[PDB]
Amino acid sequence: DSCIQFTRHASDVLLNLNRLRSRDILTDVVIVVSREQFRAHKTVLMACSGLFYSIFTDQLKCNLSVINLDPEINPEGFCILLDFMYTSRLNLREGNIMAVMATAMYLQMEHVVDTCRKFIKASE
Amino acid sequence: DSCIQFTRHASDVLLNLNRLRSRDILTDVVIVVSREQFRAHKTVLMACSGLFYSIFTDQLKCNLSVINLDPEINPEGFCILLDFMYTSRLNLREGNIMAVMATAMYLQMEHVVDTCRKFIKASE
Amino acid sequence: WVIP
Amino acid sequence: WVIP
Ligand SMILES: O=C1Cc2cc(Nc3ncncc3Cl)ccc2N1
Ligand SMILES: O=C1Cc2cc(Nc3ncncc3Cl)ccc2N1
Ligand SMILES: [Cl-]
Ligand SMILES: [Cl-]
Numbered sequence: 001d002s003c004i005q006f007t008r009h010a011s012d013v014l015l016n017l018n019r020l021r022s023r024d025i026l027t028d029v030v031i032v033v034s035r036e037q038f039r040a041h042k043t044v045l046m047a048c049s050g051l052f053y054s055i056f057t058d059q060l061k062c063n064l065s066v067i068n069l070d071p072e073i074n075p076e077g078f079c080i081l082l083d084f085m086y087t088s089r090l091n092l093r094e095g096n097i098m099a100v101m102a103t104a105m106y107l108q109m110e111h112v113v114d115t116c117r118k119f120i121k122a123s124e
Numbered sequence: 125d126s127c128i129q130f131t132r133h134a135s136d137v138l139l140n141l142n143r144l145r146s147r148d149i150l151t152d153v154v155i156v157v158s159r160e161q162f163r164a165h166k167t168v169l170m171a172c173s174g175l176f177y178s179i180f181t182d183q184l185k186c187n188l189s190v191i192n193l194d195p196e197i198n199p200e201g202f203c204i205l206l207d208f209m210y211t212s213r214l215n216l217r218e219g220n221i222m223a224v225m226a227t228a229m230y231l232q233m234e235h236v237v238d239t240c241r242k243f244i245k246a247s248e
Numbered sequence: 249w250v251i252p
Numbered sequence: 253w254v255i256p
Contacts (some may be wrong), residue, residue: 009212010134016171047140088133
């Protein structure tokens with residue numbers, strides 16, 4: 001087509017979605033991790049994660065207001081990834097890299113899994 | 125902080141939100157324009173438009189599944205702006221610029237209003 | 249704004 | 253990935 005494009009549009013949209021999350025506006029699901037609860041927007045979770053995409057396209061699960069993650073999932077690893085989903089920023093540190101990679105593999109967040117693999121390979 | 129950032133994350137999220145819109149997945153509102161109906165996600169509309177932000181933060185309207193726009197709003201102008209919201213691409217043409225600018229002013233989409241003003245000023 |  |  002002959003469209004023009006606003007370079008900062010996608011980033012501005014994501015920033016506003018994160019402001020709605022902060023203020024708990026129109027959040028439609030609670031993700032439960034080892035008795036730690038995280039409120040979010042189903043559409044953002046689906047846009048970022050192959051696991052949430054499969055969950056919320058399921059005819060029965062699409063209607064659930066609570067999703068319980070596998071007990072092996074670490075709440076801090078989930079929190080870091082949820083922050084990444086809404087900001088593009090990943091708080092990757094020596095002390096959390098193993099939990100973050102394991103959570104990203106479970107959530108099916110391929111780009112996060114890739115950088116964790118590379119950061120681990122550099123330290124060996 | 126000491127975060128790393130994935131450059132293409134915001135664009136990838138928006139692209140996936142547009143794929144959900146195409147497939148009518150988790151759309152939670154119908155916008156009615158001069159008897160033309162457009163399905164969308166309330167959170168994306170709020171992230172892009174000052175008007176939808178005000179509408180869906182209102183305690184009564186946040187719960188509506190149908191929103192009727194002012195009868196002076198042109199459906200094509202709305203369609204072009206809805207596409208912009210989900211893609212960052214604006215199909216601005218000599219034949220639609222007046223309808224697009226009037227719709228962007230009503231929807232409170234300041235960056236769109238700005239480029240329409242500049243494109244109109246260049247043609248005078 | 250840019251030409252994509 | 254970049255340093256923001
Ligand atoms: O690594 C990843 C990130 C990711 C996101 C999604 N999401 C969607 N895919 C296609 N159409 C719509 C959506 Cl919402 C699916 C798989 C994966 N895998
Ligand atoms: O031009 C524009 C675009 C736009 C978007 C919004 N959205 C939000 N603002 C702040 N926190 C959350 C959200 Cl969702 C408000 C006003 C305007 N004005
Ligand atoms: Cl990812
Ligand atoms: Cl705008």
